Amino acid sequence: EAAAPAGPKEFTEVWNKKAPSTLIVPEFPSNYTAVKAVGEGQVHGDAFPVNFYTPHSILSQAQKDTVVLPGVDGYFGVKASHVPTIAQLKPGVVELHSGAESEKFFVSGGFAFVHPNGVTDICVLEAATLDQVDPAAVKSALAAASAAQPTDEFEQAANRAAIELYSALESAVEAKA
């Protein structure tokens, strides 16, 4: 049921009723975004625009043709016009493809959306590519993680996240072709 049409342009009239005319109408974050989800386009062939984001850095806003994401049900490739999805990512390697060239970032988790206008958005919290991570401290960190296991629920959830991330990072450092 859609009997309550909320939104930015519906906020303006109620703001002109209950807030005074001394102030201009406040902005909304949908006024700064030129690209939406249902507004069709952006594919125009075999490429499709990717948006690899961390909270501290925009890693890519180029147009790729193949995106490999580490979903919680396993890895999956995103071609040009994928089905619209909301994929929770586990620790793994995101692989971008421009053709012969590739970017392989190892992420720490986060999400990945594919939208009905063919755009995709990869929303992680820390994405370090594989030359920035050392292979010497990942085994030290897993040995310091998978051995001391507290039976408390919070510490064992942290330990499960630790062994998952460090196992994926150990399986990702030597699996470069």
Partner: protein
Amino acid sequence: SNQAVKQRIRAIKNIGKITKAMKMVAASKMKNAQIAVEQSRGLVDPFVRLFGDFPAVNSNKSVVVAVTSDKGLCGGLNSNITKYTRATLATTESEGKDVVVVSIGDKGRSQLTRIESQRYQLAIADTYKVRVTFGQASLIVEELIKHNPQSYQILFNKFRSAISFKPTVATILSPDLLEKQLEDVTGNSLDAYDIEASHERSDVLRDLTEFHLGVTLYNAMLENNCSEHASRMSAMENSTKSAGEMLGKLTLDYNRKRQATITTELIEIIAGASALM
């Protein structure tokens, strides 16, 4: 007499030197903390692309946070978003609902605990001392989802430019309370998305809305920090202009008093010498 105006001149002169130094300090802080504001603008795009933007929702509980500043030479920022806070809050409280008002920065706890005092539960400060990080904003969002409202209003000044700061409200609908209801369009608009999570959609939406609150809260306080620096850069220019204008008038006043002083002392000496000679 004539020494108090000279010491007041010496006061306003180094007040003008102070404010001219503070303008360039705030300008360098605006230049350094602009690239982080430009980087953090990316991650707020896919969540308003996915969840939309619905400010005027009818809710049962709403945590409204007004992201103010820490130090207060910003000159019309922390009161302007207090005005915008009450202007966007009177718009969206006509359902008989509860409203929690929060302030990030301790120049908002001085301006919000007298206009809406009994609905003020939380005051956050010191978030700009070292820097703004995502773990800090995630902890602040964790104390925001201590209580479970149906909406999260974020009041902050969007750093549009070094001249213009548009105050921006951003809303986060909590998942099963409002987000699964505010997306129904002959069925739903979220059912076009194929959920590829471990558990059900009611939990991946919970994780997505907490992460969206953390993302836009981090971006909100980063934008508000850059607007603080860019408004202090203009307020200290106004203070240099005012303390140059006051100094220019007080210099003329001192010159008039100096001229009158030599004239009256000379007239006293002539009046003494004309009684004897």
